[PDB]
């Protein structure tokens, strides 16, 4: 059972939804997880790091591990897609903070996941500025309970 909006749409458009205007996205049964954001040559992706909430979160459920990412400057994000290999994970938009301009997105990731690919875009100069490949690499492997070294 899922009641949150599944992102199949531009992020700039789904933040207009009233279901998730300043909606409580607390989840106490969870922990911090640090992360990098990187281009295809292994370098860092400067905008995707600079405008992502530090740290991310890992939310623990009875079936599989869920990651929350807070994306700053949400009205300006167009495309936002997340993949494990090249199998497209569905992205649930949980909250949009109106004062601060922050979208908070959730995706269920497989057990033992080290990193995750991001096809994305932003709205600059009335044009689509594409980012082909961003790897959201995590500080350590993502499992669903308390067993993280």
């Amino acid at each position, epitope marked *: 059972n899922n009641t949150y909006p599944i992102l199949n749409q531009e992020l700039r458009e789904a933040i207009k939804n009233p279901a998730i205007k300043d909606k409580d996205h607390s989840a106490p049964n969870s922990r911090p997880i640090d992360f990098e954001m990187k281009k295809k*040559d292994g*370098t*860092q992706q*400067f*905008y995707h*790091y*600079a*405008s992502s909430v530090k740290p991310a979160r890992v939310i623990f459920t009875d079936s599989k591990p869920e990651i929350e990412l807070g994306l*700053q*400057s949400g*009205q*300006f994000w167009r495309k936002f897609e997340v993949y494990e290999g090249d199998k497209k994970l569905p992205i649930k938009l949980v909250s949009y903070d109106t004062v601060k*301009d922050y979208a908070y997105i959730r995706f269920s990731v497989s057990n033992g996941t080290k990193a995750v690919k991001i096809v994305s875009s*932003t709205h*600059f*100069n009335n*044009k689509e*500025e594409k*980012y082909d490949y961003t790897l959201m690499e995590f500080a350590q492997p993502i499992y669903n309970s308390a067993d993280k070294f």
Partner: antibody, heavy 128, light 108 residues
């Protein structure tokens, strides 16, 4: 052809905040670059990267000035700003407002080539 | 921080001489390295970006060598107006750090 210029003041008390303003003059609409930079130059002529502010107001500051620096976009007035807290004598530098070089095709864009236009720079001494 | 080093730190050379400055990084930096020129009492001016690409309006006497860890700014024929200090800057890792400079004196 974007020109850039720096607003004062040039004197700051130790502890109190260095607050500088950069007014985007030329071709303007402040979505004529994807990001904007701040660089400074210490009295030994060494250059340090302060940080950037993008088109959307998200920022990326040096991990050696993190806890102290801050930047807004104004976008209605053609301005971006620098704030620096908890100031010592070490911060006595010439502060430079700057803009990236962008690519050959479909520019301006998210490119990390170097900085092409630069302010005239503003000296800021810290003294009692 | 990636440290950038520049050799020499000072350089006296004559009008019409071939001058070759160098700049090394502490790790791999690809082609993400620009070269600047600072004249006295003046803001820096981009000369070369991406290792070897010349900037608009700059005279075609400035070159720059290609990717890795050792880099090079060349002034083919040095003139009176080339006085100042020549900085390199990397754009691989954040923060985008700078070199010490190469100060260039004109022999006369």
């Amino acid at each position: 052809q974007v020109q850039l210029q720096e607003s004062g003041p040039g004197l700051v008390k130790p502890s109190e905040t260095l607050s500088l303003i950069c007014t985007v003059s030329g071709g303007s609409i402040s979505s004529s670059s994807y990001y904007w930079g701040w660089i400074r130059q210490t009295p030994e002529r060494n250059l340090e990267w302060i940080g950037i502010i993008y088109f959307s107001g998200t920022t990326y500051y040096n991990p050696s000035l993190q806890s102290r620096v801050s930047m807004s976009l104004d976008r209605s007035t053609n301005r971006f700003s620098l704030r620096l807290s908890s100031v010592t004598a070490a911060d006595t530098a010439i502060y430079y407002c700057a803009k990236p070089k962008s690519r050959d095709r479909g520019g301006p864009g998210d490119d990390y080539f170097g900085m092409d236009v630069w302010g005239q720079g503003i000296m800021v001494t810290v003294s009692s | 921080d990636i440290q950038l080093t520049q050799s020499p730190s000072f350089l006296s050379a004559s009008v019409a001489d071939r001058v070759t400055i160098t700049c090394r990084a502490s790790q791999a930096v690809r082609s993400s390295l620009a070269w600047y020129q600072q004249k006295p009492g003046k803001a820096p001016q981009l000369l070369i970006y991406s290792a070897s690409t010349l900037e608009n309006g700059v005279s075609s006497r400035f070159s720059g060598s290609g990717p890795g860890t050792e880099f090079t700014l060349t002034i083919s024929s040095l003139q009176p107006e080339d006085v100042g200090t020549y900085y390199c800057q990397q754009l691989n890792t954040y923060p985008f750090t700078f070199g010490p400079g190469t100060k260039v004196e004109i022999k006369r």
